[PDB]
């Protein structure tokens, strides 16, 4: 299945489990904890803190079985050398659109990252009971061994600090427990009206509603003023829509998070990247 992070520090494991971890240092996103031989490792590095509303990613570190891929915002580095994309070596495809940077590996790994904040990973069914990252394990059980290990229920803030990576020059402080705010239930009407629109018709049976509307609750009351946190969750709902197989419609109006592209390049959701180019 799919692990994913997006928005203002929202996460989603291979078995659901949407939570919110505002850690800023350097983490393990998914890894092969089989024990005998590690096939892959994906290391996430949150930035210095962009602002209150967004939450970027500074760099992604990825090691597949012989070689190390280092992704930043502008360039992609394979084994210390800059690559021109697309890159076609016979176990590894690295290609760069105008929106996403994809990495396709024969080991059953697929990474896809727009270069600000949204990062998603896809693994095949070979790695079951072996993954050990912040994306949980890949057993299929909802919240079983991620949060309730030996009877004690781990909070999502102490589940994330366990997944940290120690770098041998820099001391980075873990984020402390904030005082428990009010459960923002005074904006459930706006998230339910917005996300179940007519454009999301043939995905109400594919992806659920309750996790991605729960994540919409904090994005309305932690991000006041401009709407830049609510349209990274419904932008993630229209990516989970168009990954199971469905096709969403256009929801971005001129007043609901518009996007601009030069020329007469109109923006759409669910259209093919294979363009005939004159």
């Amino acid at each position: 299945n799919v692990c994913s992070t997006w928005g203002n520090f929202h996460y989603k494991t291979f078995d659901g489990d949407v939570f919110r971890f505002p850690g800023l240092c350097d983490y393990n996103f998914a890894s092969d904890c089989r024990g005998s031989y590690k096939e892959f490792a994906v290391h996430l590095k949150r930035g210095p803190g962009q602002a209150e509303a967004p939450a970027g990613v500074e760099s992604i570190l990825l090691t597949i079985k012989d070689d190390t891929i280092y992704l930043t915002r502008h360039l992609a580095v394979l084994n210390g050398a800059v690559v021109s994309t697309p890159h076609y070596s016979p176990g590894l495809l690295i290609e760069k659109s105008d929106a996403y940077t994809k990495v396709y590996s024969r080991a059953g790994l697929t990474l896809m990252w727009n270069r600000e904040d949204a990062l998603m990973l896809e693994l095949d069914t070979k790695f079951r009971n072996h993954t050990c990252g912040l994306c949980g394990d890949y057993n299929g059980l909802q919240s079983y061994s991620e949060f309730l290990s030996d009877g004690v229920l781990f909070s999502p803030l102490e589940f994330g600090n366990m997944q940290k990576i120690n770098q041998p020059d820099v001391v980075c402080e873990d984020p402390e427990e904030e005082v428990a705010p009010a459960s923002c239930s005074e904006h459930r009407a706006e998230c339910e009206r917005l996300l179940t629109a007519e454009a999301f018709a043939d995905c109400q049976d594919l992806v659920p509603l309750e996790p991605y509307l729960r994540a919409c609750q904090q994005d309305r009351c932690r991000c006041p003023g401009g709407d830049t946190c609510v349209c990274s969750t419904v932008a993630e709902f229209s990516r989970q829509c168009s990954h199971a197989g469905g096709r969403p419609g256009n929801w971005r109006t001129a007043t609901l998070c518009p996007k601009t592209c030069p020329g007469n390049l109109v923006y759409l959701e669910s259209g093919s990247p294979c363009m005939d180019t004159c």
């Binding site: 570190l61 090691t63 190390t68 041998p168």
Partner: protein, 430 residues
């Protein structure tokens, strides 16, 4: 130099300028067909005359007619337990083990004499991140047990002791608060390091040669039989030899590990490359030792421990302080190698005393001057810690006052007391 060439001469004869019947040609100097008993020797440079003796490592040699005649001198042997797991036996033979038990490091073979144990347990997360934790000494016909925990805390027979502690058969000192020096009358000397990581250095005389067993080998000159177990035959690997020296029967058996840690960790392997390369480049104060120590094997272990342990700077600074340790053992002392690399404790010395590189046992207080022949214990190595300069010996507490008003040690009285012995500079008028 190359005598007896003509016994392997696959050439016919021609003309040219030659030697007479005897009178071999001078190669080492520059003269002609000199007699054989005027051949000047050579030894890394200098043109030694035929008869000039020299004092080498463990032997003394005299230049005979072209060849050296060497004769053995007594010299000790040193087993080291560095890092968490890097054993160097008495006869060379460095190996890596990664145990989890008490292990017999050296013990006397007769029935009693002594036994030196040591705990090599995992300290980090995995099993391959091991550390030394406890040194146990069983001395004086194995009725006295001395325990060296990894926080100081020397304790004899489950009871804390105060240092120094000088007895008839052994004595334990503490000169620099991260260094413990133990001397025995049998011929065994210990040096326990406490910071950054715990390490151990053992020294035997050459009278005990071929008369010890443990993880330090048998000390007989050959290093092919150091992996010879106590039941016959030589083992192949270090972890197969060392499972025969478990001091507890309920310990599991350990196995080797054919991996390097600098491939399993990509974030630690650039930090290991940048800082352990200072052992090999000559702009640093480590190129002074390159003529004596040959850092190519310290560089390989420096990368090993740095990529492996969880606190990477404590394994860097321990492996850089072991090249500097084994270079002062051959004369070349590195004054001031801690200025760019491991200086997180240099400036933290107290108000009067400074950071030294040649701190020894007999630079102590004026209470040590009261005995002055009882506890000095020559034969150890100098260590680096906080201490006082060339004068102004240490007082009873705090700063080190000069020699005139030091103390008069009975209780250490101040410099105003009259017995008829007026308290004076060091000595007393008694």
């Amino acid at each position: 130099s190359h005598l007896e060439v003509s016994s392997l001469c696959e050439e016919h004869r021609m003309d040219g300028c030659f030697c007479p019947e005897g009178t071999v040609y001078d190669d080492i100097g520059d003269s002609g067909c000199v007699p054989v008993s005027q051949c000047h020797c050579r030894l890394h440079g200098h043109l030694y005359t035929p008869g000039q003796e020299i004092t080498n490592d463990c032997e003394q040699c005299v230049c005979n007619a072209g060849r050296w005649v060497c004769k053995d001198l007594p010299c000790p042997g040193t087993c080291a337990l560095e890092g968490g797991s890097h054993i160097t036996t008495f006869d060379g033979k460095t190996y890596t083990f990664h145990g989890d038990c008490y292990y017999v490091l050296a013990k006397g073979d007769h029935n009693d004499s002594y036994a030196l144990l040591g705990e090599l347990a995992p300290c980090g997360s995995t099993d391959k991140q091991t550390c030394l934790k406890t040194v146990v000494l069983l001395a004086d016909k194995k009725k006295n047990a001395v325990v060296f925990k990894s926080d100081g805390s020397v304790l004899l027979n489950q009871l804390q002791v105060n240092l120094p502690h000088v007895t008839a058969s052994f004595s334990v000192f503490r000169p620099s608060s991260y260094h413990i020096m133990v001397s025995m009358a049998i011929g065994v000397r210990l040096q326990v390091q406490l910071a950054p990581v715990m390490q151990l250095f053992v020294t035997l005389d050459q009278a005990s040669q071929g008369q010890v067993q443990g993880l330090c080998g048998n000390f007989n000159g050959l290093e092919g039989d150091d992996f010879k177990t106590a039941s016959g035959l030589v083992e192949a690997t270090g972890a197969g030899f060392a499972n025969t020296w478990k001091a507890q029967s309920t310990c599991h058996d350990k196995l080797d590990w054919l991996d390097d840690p600098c491939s399993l960790n990509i974030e630690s392997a650039n930090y290991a490359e940048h800082w352990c390369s200072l052992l090999k480049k000559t702009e640093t104060p480590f190129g002074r030792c390159h003529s004596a120590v040959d850092p190519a094997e310290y560089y390989k272990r420096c990368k090993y421990d740095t990529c492996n342990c969880q606190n990477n700077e404590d394994c860097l600074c321990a492996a850089l302080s072991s090249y500097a340790r084994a270079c002062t053992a051959k004369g070349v002392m590195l004054w001031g190698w801690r200025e760019h690399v491991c200086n997180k404790d240099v400036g933290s010395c107290p108000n009067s005393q400074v950071f030294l590189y040649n701190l020894t046992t007999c630079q102590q207080t004026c209470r040590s001057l009261s005995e002055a022949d009882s506890h000095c214990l020559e034969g150890f190595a100098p260590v680096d810690g906080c201490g006082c300069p060339d004068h102004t010996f240490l007082d009873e507490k705090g700063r080190c006052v000069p020699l005139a008003k030091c103390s008069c040690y009975g209780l250490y009285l101040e410099a105003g007391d009259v017995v008829r012995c007026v308290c004076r500079d060091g000595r007393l008028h008694c």
